[PDB]
Amino acid sequence: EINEVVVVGMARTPIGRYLGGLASVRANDLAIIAANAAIERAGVDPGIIDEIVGATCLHAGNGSLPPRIIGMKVGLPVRSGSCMVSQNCASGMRATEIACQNIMLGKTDISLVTAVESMSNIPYLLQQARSGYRMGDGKVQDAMLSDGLVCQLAGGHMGMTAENIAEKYGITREECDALALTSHQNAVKAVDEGIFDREIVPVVIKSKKGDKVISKDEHPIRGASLETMAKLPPAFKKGGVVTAANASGINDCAAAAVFMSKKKCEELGLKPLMKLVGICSEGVDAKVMGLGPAVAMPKVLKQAGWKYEDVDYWEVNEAFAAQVLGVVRMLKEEAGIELDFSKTNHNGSGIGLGHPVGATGLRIIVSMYYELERLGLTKGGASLCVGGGSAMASLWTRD
Amino acid sequence: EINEVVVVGMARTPIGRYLGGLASVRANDLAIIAANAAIERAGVDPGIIDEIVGATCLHAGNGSLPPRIIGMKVGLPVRSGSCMVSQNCASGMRATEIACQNIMLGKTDISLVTAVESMSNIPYLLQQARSGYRMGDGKVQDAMLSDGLVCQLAGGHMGMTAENIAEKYGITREECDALALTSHQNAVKAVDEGIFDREIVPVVIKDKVISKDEHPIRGASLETMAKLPPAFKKGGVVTAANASGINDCAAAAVFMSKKKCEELGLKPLMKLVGICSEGVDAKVMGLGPAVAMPKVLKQAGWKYEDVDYWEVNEAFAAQVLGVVRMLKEEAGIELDFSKTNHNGSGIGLGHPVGATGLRIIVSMYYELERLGLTKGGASLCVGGGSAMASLWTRDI
Amino acid sequence: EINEVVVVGMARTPIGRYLGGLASVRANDLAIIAANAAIERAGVDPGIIDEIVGATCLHAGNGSLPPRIIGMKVGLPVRSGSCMVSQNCASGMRATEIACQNIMLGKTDISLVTAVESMSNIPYLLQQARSGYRMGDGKVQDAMLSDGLVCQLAGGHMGMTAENIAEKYGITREECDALALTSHQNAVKAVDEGIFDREIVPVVIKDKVISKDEHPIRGASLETMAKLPPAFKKGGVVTAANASGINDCAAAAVFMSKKKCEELGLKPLMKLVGICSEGVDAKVMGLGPAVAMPKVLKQAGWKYEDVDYWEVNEAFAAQVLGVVRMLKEEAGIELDFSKTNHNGSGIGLGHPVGATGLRIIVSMYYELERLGLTKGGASLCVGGGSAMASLWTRDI
Amino acid sequence: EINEVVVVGMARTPIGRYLGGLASVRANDLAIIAANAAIERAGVDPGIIDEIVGATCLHAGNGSLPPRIIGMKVGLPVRSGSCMVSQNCASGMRATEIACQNIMLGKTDISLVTAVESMSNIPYLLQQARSGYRMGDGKVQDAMLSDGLVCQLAGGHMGMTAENIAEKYGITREECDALALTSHQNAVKAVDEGIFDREIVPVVIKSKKGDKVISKDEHPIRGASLETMAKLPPAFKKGGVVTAANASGINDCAAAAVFMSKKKCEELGLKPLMKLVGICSEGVDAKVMGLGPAVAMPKVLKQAGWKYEDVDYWEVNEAFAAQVLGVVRMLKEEAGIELDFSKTNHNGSGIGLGHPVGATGLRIIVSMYYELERLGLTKGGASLCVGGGSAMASLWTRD
């Protein structure tokens, strides 16, 4: 029969601003810092880790199979496995599943999962450079948009799909700005109070004149007020309800985690932090991808036999304020769920802290656990929508 | 209670030459052709497919999560799952594992796997364009190399790790050119004989049509191989002819739990027996198969002799000759070439990286079917070192 | 006291096709070949040449002040002067004027003029690369168009200004295709007959060699011209075949004061009589010659009848038919095609922009020499409108 | 016989910093501002100007025959001539010659000369984009270097040729920094005192929130001291004497001038500012291009029958401090000239004010005149070295 899987170490870097504090740190070097932190915290010798499952949305520019580069540099054995997975925003959560199911089936005993996105260092593409443009102008493409944020099925930017959710359920700019403010404010609150200090591993910038250190998330807007939110123009559509402040940002980050079979963790005398309960995907139409969590969360709860009210804390990534309010509505209408804001996103989410696409899937799992630990809770869950529709959700317990 | 996994449909496009007959068709449309072919050969309604696991080495330029695009265009339901996986050369073989483990654990009942590489359409990269070059020249990088064929751990192109194996085992070029020739000739023979016509779905150009593998060096002679200069090292044994080629191709397969196939009334073609990864040092990643094949065999309770036929990709002639030998010295295996790569391999037919991992699986089965055999296996080395191997049986 | 100006040596390379036989040779090395040819045909020691006036339309990609590089490689003394001039299509004809005015005023005694366009090697531009794109797609611009063929004043490609002339004078396509055909056929005839062998210096490829003009549409028929679609306007009279082509070529000439040529014991080939510019509105820049030819004729005291032969570049069939007519209506000139463009022109032989201005001068002379004639003239329209014209005589 | 030529109007924009105040103004729009200023100051109807001779070093990116665009936009008649000339740093001075010799020979009566270089907006090149890179990496080239500052004949940057002059004549870092300081200090002096206000025409940046105006040259280094000059590292060679402070800068600018036959200026009742006396080129080896002025200045003086001491004021462009000190030496050794620093570059030159390559050739002529006018002098001269060697010099008088 299948093994039980546990998490033994978890870490993430700060979430940097687009072209901000971490713009000088390429994705692989952020992954190495987060991976080393998780490995040390677990107390496992990197030489016995069986594989690395690396998550990222934009491979381009980071070399041949970056996860193999990241694994070898943190000391994985050359015998270890390596692969790179992408499910857009849920990349880190799908890497977690792939690794855990490998452990479930006995294929591995210890698996490293890295999730990273350095959106400040995504290159531009020259599509016709190989065979030549022959004649006439072409396009030098921003890969972060053409290969990531701009969905072909949706027809435009992710923000447009949030506008669809606002239209369908009739969400207004006032409701979006209200929710968005709390995220910026909650994020500001937790950042300055040091709530993220435990999970964070700092990133050190090796400047020539000196040596700077990034230890704090830097996306949230300080001094946000309900009237300041109302002063921003629409960011993606004329008269659209989505703005830069009520929409998740563009950001850099890397998260990592060490997973293990329950019995391997016991053999090594290590401390299991929490146990995988469930994890799965479930899609919605690309044009309303934001509602994915409203179908993934009930599904994973069914697979595990839990009721929504059983989960002690939730980390539901806020891609856009309208997107969240659409999830609340769909969860009330087509599910029997009244989203418990008192046990969900306590310290801000994507809107306030940012959305490093490739890292976020695992980021919210890391943050979920450490919030459980700070509040002495037991059962946690994390879900998030995905560009294209295929959303994910996962459930965990601290035994 | 763990579910049995069977393959109901498989397809692949012809293996086009670098900048050749398929250069005008992008990766996504190549994957769509193969997937539609595998779907109709399985005879399943694409509306009930639970997920797509898409393999490719270079995502750059192909849009947002191509596997989601590929799935929706071939008719997957919006509730289906989607993801992109890369294990360099074995990407197609890892996507298979991922989908098969989803079926093993009951997460899904029907999973579509696509594996594609359009190396003719890999874009070039401008790394400093976003923040600006400010002053001074920059680099317009060939992503095919910087993000694929050139490995930092190995210190250079994949061909250097082939040269490293040559030095380790003192493999001369004559052995490299001799193996390469038989790979080119075998590919030419099987292409002209139409052996690949069953597995192939043709690519229509919007009105020309490509339907034959076009990489094999025709008229290859023992001595034409000797006149070519080394390609990656001064005085090295690796040449363009005895090295795998750069190519375009797409392969697809529809997997299912055995209970689902019976319920739907379809015919399982072969059942998964074993699948696994196992790595070697990046400097000699070509030796990967020599550790992955004995492992998957041990995992499955199979001895090497049980396998009727193997599809073992030839990344480089020196690499294969190193695998033949490491298997002899550190394993108890004398590689049986009479039961391995009958119809040319990576050297003769080409190496469309993203698709190869699954391509050899497809070629494996149809050779089992053509020879009335039962047990088959496939394995391949991987850039970086993490090789893979798999075992299958038609005796469901 | 103003000095008399004579031409002692002239040369030109074959007119290669866009991305054709000369695509591998850059502008500078094409100019070096022509210049060396003109130098030895003049029989002058390049060490005493006082300056080089280099013409080209697209400097981008050819290094720092190419004319200085060209001069030093063909053996000009370091004390020599150097400069680059551009009047789009007439660049070669303006460089000639500049050098001839330097000789007229005693500033120099020997001036070398090179005129080159390697349109196959014009680079693409990244306008935002320096400061950064920050976010969002950008443009990779074809400089050949943005910095040359596409004119902002005219509102579009050079072909639209040809269409504008067609509407102004109601010129149908049948007239355009008919003139185009004779230009293609005449070019084919003269190419095969070796008439251009005297003026041509062949280009050696490092070991193939190009020596014949390769643009003429062979087997051109009245009805093949009618099946081609319009190229620049919906329902427009301009097609690729009746429009001038994109090409590569270099021409060179060594000018001298008549007193210097006698002092050195060399043979003057022809003497400058008149040269000037005169513009028209950019929207109908093709009509330029209809104002530049009567002006230079008036400037020189020559009537049109005095000129034995003309080389008038054909930018577009409609453009020439407009020039023929504006010359009739506003000037007293009925353009004598029996004494104009005997051996194909821009439509048949191509339009290597930077070189054309001087190329037609070279072709003019050798036709005068081939026919034993004396007085010659050359003129051409220019992107933007500032056309030029010149008059020459072998009766020094 | 040949006509006498006069200048009737002159203007230039401020010299902006590389990527500085004028980085948003493309070369053609700077040329239009300078051209309109010169035309208005001359008091000539633009509809009768016979031609425009446009000077610039880097055409790329500025459209089809920019001088024709610039001429039509300032109101030249469609009958007028147009052409673009380049002699690297002497581009503006060669455009002046071409136009003047056209007037000398009766080909034109009124000629507009524009000289511009917007080095902040020089594009990058993709050389193999047309036919394709086929396979392997290429180079995305900085055209300002590959097509301008980097000389193939010299083997490297212009700064290297200045190092050759320092080596040949044994010029030391101390002598270079001393001269360079005075240029920065003299430039600072004249800028703040408004000495350039007459010749300058301001450039207006049409920002959205507001409207900013550039009216002052912005290259000179404020607070320069002899010890601050000694603190900068070599900019182009190990242990080289050339630094960013003692080397001319990278800058944006446009200058323009209206030239006329003496008799055409009289017919229109206009005021001739000064009369062309002489103008010519003379080259030196590309590897020591800096010494060009030491051979061009004596030559033009011979053509005109003047002695060096006859010139009331000189504008000799300082490309590099070592380059100038080499000119002083060559003028003393191979010419009989003791460079009169008391009548040369009173208000700083290329080192202090900057070196917009395409505009400088005419810039120093404009500045030369207005310094003559401020000091009530009569005879002026302007010369400058050129990348590759072909240098130029010109002589003028206020009658």
Residue numbers in the entry:
A (entry chain B), D (entry chain B): 4 to 402
B (entry chain A), C (entry chain A): 4 to 209, 214 to 403
Quote the study that presented this structure, word for word.
Syntrophomonas wolfei is a syntrophic bacterium that is a leading model for examining how microbial communities degrade short-chain fatty acids. Syntrophomonas wolfei Göttingen uses acyl-CoA transferases to activate fatty acid substrates by synthesizing the respective CoA derivative. An acyl-CoA transferase paralog of particular interest is Act2 (Swol_0675). Act2 had numerous acylations and certain sites were modified by several different acyl groups.
To understand how these PTMs might affect the enzyme’s function, the structure of Act2, encoded by the gene Swol_0675, was determined by X-ray crystallography. The asymmetric unit of the tetragonal crystal lattice contains two molecules of Act2, which form a homodimeric structure. About 15% of the solvent accessible surface area of the monomer, or ~ 15,000 Å2, is buried in the intermolecular interface. Examination of crystal packing indicates that the Act2 homodimer likely forms a homotetramer mediated by a short β-strand-containing loop spanning residues Tyr127 to Asp140. A homotetrameric structure is consistent with the Act2 molecular mass estimated from size exclusion chromatography, with the computational prediction by the PISA webserver, and with existing acetyl-CoA transferase structures that also have a similar homotetrameric structures. The position of the four key catalytic residues (C91, N319, H357, C387) is virtually identical in all four of the structures as is the shielding of the active site by the covering (residues 146–161) and pantetheine loops (residues 246–250), which were identified in the human mitochondrial acetoacetyl- CoA thiolase. All the acyl-lysine sites identified in our proteomic datasets were mapped onto the S. wolfei Act2 structure and all are on the protein’s surface, with three sites located closer to the covering and pantetheine loop, K75, K208, and K233. The proximity of these modified lysine residues near the substrate tunnel suggest that these PTMs may be connected to the local buildup of RACS in this region. While the other modification sites are located on the enzyme’s surface but not near the substrate tunnel, these lysine residues could be involved in salt-bridge interactions that mediate tetramer formation. Out of these 5 sites, K75, K208, and K304 were located near the covering and pantetheine loops that surrounds the substrate tunnel, suggesting that these acyl modifications could affect substrate accessibility.
